[PDB]
Design a binder for this molecule. Structure first.
Ligand code: HEM
Ligand SMILES: CC[C@H]1OC(=O)[C@H](C)[C@@H](O[C@H]2O[C@@H](C)C[C@@H](N(C)C)[C@@H]2O)[C@@H](C)C[C@H](C)C(=O)/C=C/[C@H]1C
Length: 391
């Protein structure tokens, strides 16, 4: 047992040793998260990678001996929290809207938002600004909002809720933020029906209305929620976490500026080295699972620590080395198996474009604060900074 909460900001800023110390003992460990959830952690690449796809580990709450709260039960009917055949049917509804080829068509607009964002930051008569506030946050929400059909003004709200799901001002703020969001979503869905809108939310509504067995109303709400939540802090932290590593490793920042053909690889290294998903979402085994002699009971919550698999020397030689030229093949930053991130092409698209943009423009690009003054979130599921001042 370990109370990651008790560990404090020290564990949050650098949780890797802890996960590593555990990986040296066994492949699974019962811990208590900063908020207070008692779960099992799966560490070590091979085991992490295997568990992720393993059919034995279900993502359907019906298989969790720890039941959903009321607020959460309004949102669990989504592809990420289901197993086939439901997962299969639900992902097929949006699969075509997220392929590399369809996403690429968004380049002009994505490239467009970044330029504007970067032009404003540079206007800073201080040569100093927060890259989190100026680019990392604005971009993700703007892109997804236009795609689905979430009004510009309602986007702040999501910043607040998403904040609460990761770190609530109390074990209640999370549950209340879910409720508020679940109510916003439903109302927005209502406002869309019969309006002949062309945005993706409008399409999904029509589909639900065409065949409720194809997409139930509780799945229509679940779908909307998952497409807007699953990629929010994740994409935002990929960008903040990616620029930071590069900024904290000038050797690599110089490498990319000098050779832009390293872009896609450097982003892959970012995902690897400091991806925003520290631990994958809840899995619940359908039956007892002996792992190296460690048996997790059926129905227990399990978090696969992607961060620890990404620092497993065996798989990634010299894992603590941020190297934008390293063979990343195999990283699990976007997951592994049937649940592989559907938004990966778009996320990559946004990160790749914003990264280059900054490297090109920003002449004397550098961290404008001591790493020690940086603050991270305790949550073992998401790796992200509260701020990232640059100059
Ligand atoms: C840097 C950003 C991102 C990262 C690193 C990331 C990471 C992940 C991870 C690790 C999974 C699987 C989790 C598990 O198996 O427990 C996943 C699933 C998912 N992601 Fe992403 N994601 C990112 C961006 C996005 C974006 C931009 C969207 C939407 C456009 C998105 C939508 C989803 C959805 C719908 C799922 C569930 C897929 C399924 O259950 O089959 N993601 N993502
Ligand atoms: C896909 C990887 C990221 O996970 C998420 O976006 C998860 C799914 C999301 O989790 C929960 O959000 C609640 C509002 C509903 C709940 N479910 C019980 C209905 C759903 O599982 C994040 C909000 C959770 C964490 C805090 C996060 O910010 C992102 C984590 C990534 C691993």
């Amino acid at each position: 047992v370990l109370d990651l909460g008790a560990l404090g900001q020290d564990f949050a800023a650098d949780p890797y040793p802890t996960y590593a110390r555990l990986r040296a003992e066994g492949p699974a460990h019962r811990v208590r998260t900063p908020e207070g959830d008692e779960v099992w952690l799966v560490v070590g690449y091979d085991r992490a990678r295997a568990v992720l796809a393993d059919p034995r580990f279900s993502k359907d709450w019906r298989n969790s001996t720890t039941p959903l709260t009321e607020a959460e039960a309004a949102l669990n009917h989504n592809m990420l929290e289901s197993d086939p055949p439901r997962h299969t049917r639900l992902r097929k509804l949006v699969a075509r809207e997220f392929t590399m080829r369809r996403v690429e068509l968004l380049r002009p607009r994505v490239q467009e938002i970044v330029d504007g964002l970067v032009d404003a930051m540079l206007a800073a008569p201080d040569g100093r600004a927060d890259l989190m506030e100026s680019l990392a946050w604005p971009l993700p929400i703007t892109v997804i909002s236009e795609l689905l059909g979430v009004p510009e003004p309602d986007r702040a709200a999501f910043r607040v809720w998403t904040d609460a799901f990761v770190f609530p001002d109390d074990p209640a703020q999370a549950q209340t933020a879910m409720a508020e969001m679940s109510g916003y979503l439903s109302r927005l869905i209502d406002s869309k029906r019969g309006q002949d809108g062309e945005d993706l939310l409008s399409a999904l509504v029509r589909t639900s209305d065409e065949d409720g067995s194809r997409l139930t109303s509780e799945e229509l709400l679940g779908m909307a929620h998952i497409l807007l939540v699953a990629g929010h802090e994740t994409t935002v932290n990929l960008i903040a976490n990616g620029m930071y590593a590069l900024l904290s490793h000038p050797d690599q920042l110089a490498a990319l500026r000098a050779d832009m053909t390293l872009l896609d690889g450097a982003v892959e290294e970012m995902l690897r080295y400091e991806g925003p998903v520290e631990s994958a979402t809840y899995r619940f085994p359908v039956e007892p699972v002996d792992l190296d002699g460690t048996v997790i009971p059926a129905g227990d919550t399990v978090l696969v620590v992607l961060a620890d698999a990404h620092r497993t020397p065996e798989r990634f030689p010299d894992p603590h080395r941020f190297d934008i030229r390293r063979d990343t093949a195999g990283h699990l930053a976007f997951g592994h198996g049937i649940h592989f991130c559907i938004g990966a092409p778009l996320a990559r698209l946004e990160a790749r474009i914003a990264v280059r943009a900054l490297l090109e423009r920003c002449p004397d690009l550098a961290l404008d604060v001591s790493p020690g003054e940086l603050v991270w979130y305790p949550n073992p599921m998401i790796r992200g900074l509260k701020a990232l001042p640059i100059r």
